[PDB]
């Protein structure tokens, strides 16, 4: 639709670039002179996507491709837009004519209004591919003082890996194993800032321990190929030599309800000699 984001999925802490596009901007609406367009954007909670205030680029593109880049201000004048930011939301008002009644229009023909801006994904975002109103924003664009536009929505997305650690023979769930997560580019996950996934050295990696249920949950990752690296085996088990590949997104296995952003790899462990005896 008319509201889009730059990536199909994100990791927590990533910059999300949003684009709002409105292609029907002309000088009359009904028989009424258009003297402004109002763009209102209601974002998710800032605990989910935190708007970067002041990040806007506002343009008008005419039918020939000519671009006018607008600048911020309250004056009713060509080349301007007014901004109000409150509560993680914003409203942009673009004056369209020098006066409100019949001329003194600033722009001619059929124009496209584009607003680009950014936000930052935070820890409250929900993972997966389902209907997620909490991850969704809505932008409306209306002439003059109308509020009838039903708006354009987009949902930011991320993924989750639920690791289950078992004994390869008995299939029992095993507590106390320690893993780190590696990406496809040689780096290790540091998720110590709960609002920001980071990738770096192994020494700086976050260590995850399998719980009483054998599980580790890592929530808030971009699609891609990851590798589960065992740092400590459960008590009595041999340390696994090699990592286990886990795909999140296209190509995923072990999905929950066919959702390739909710994956459930099982890692098998091998009892060490003393434990079979
Ligand atoms: Ca130009
Ligand atoms: Ca109305
Ligand atoms: Ca980051």
Residue numbers in the entry: 185 to 286, 296 to 470
Tell me, in the authors' exact words, what the paper reports.
GBS expresses three structurally distinct pilus types, each containing at least two antigens capable of eliciting protective immunity in mouse models, confirming a key role in bacterial pathogenesis. The three GBS pilus types are coded by distinct genomic loci containing features typical of Gram-positive pilus islands (PIs). These islands, named PI-1, PI-2a and PI-2b, encode three structural pilus proteins, corresponding to the major pilus subunit (backbone protein, BP) that forms the pilus shaft and two ancillary proteins that appear to be located at the pilus tip (AP1) and at the base (AP2) as anchor protein of the pilus to the bacterial cell-wall. Prior to the discovery of pilus-structures in Gram-positive bacteria, the backbone protein of pilus 2b (BP-2b) was described as a GBS surface invasin (named surface protein of GBS 1, Spb1), due to its ability to promote invasion of epithelial cells. Here we report the structural and functional characterization of the backbone protein of pilus 2b (BP-2b).
We solved the X-ray structure of a fragment of the protein (lacking the N-terminal first 184 residues) encompassing domains D2 and D3. Both domains revealed an IgG-like fold organization, typical of the pilin subunits, and the presence of internal isopeptide bonds. Pilus Island 2b (PI-2b) has been commonly found in the epidemiologically relevant GBS serotype III-ST-17 lineage. While the assembly of the well characterized GBS pili 1 and 2a occur following the classical model, the pilus 2b seems to differ slightly: the pilus 2b components do not contain the canonical conserved primary sequence of the pilin motif described for pilus polymerization in Gram-positive bacteria, making difficult the identification of the key residues involved in pilus assembly. Finally, by site-directed mutagenesis and complementation studies in GBS strains we identified the non-canonical residues/motives essential for the BP-2b protein polymerization. Using the three-dimensional information we generated the single structurally well-defined domains as recombinant proteins and compared their protective immunity with the full length protein in a well-established mouse model.
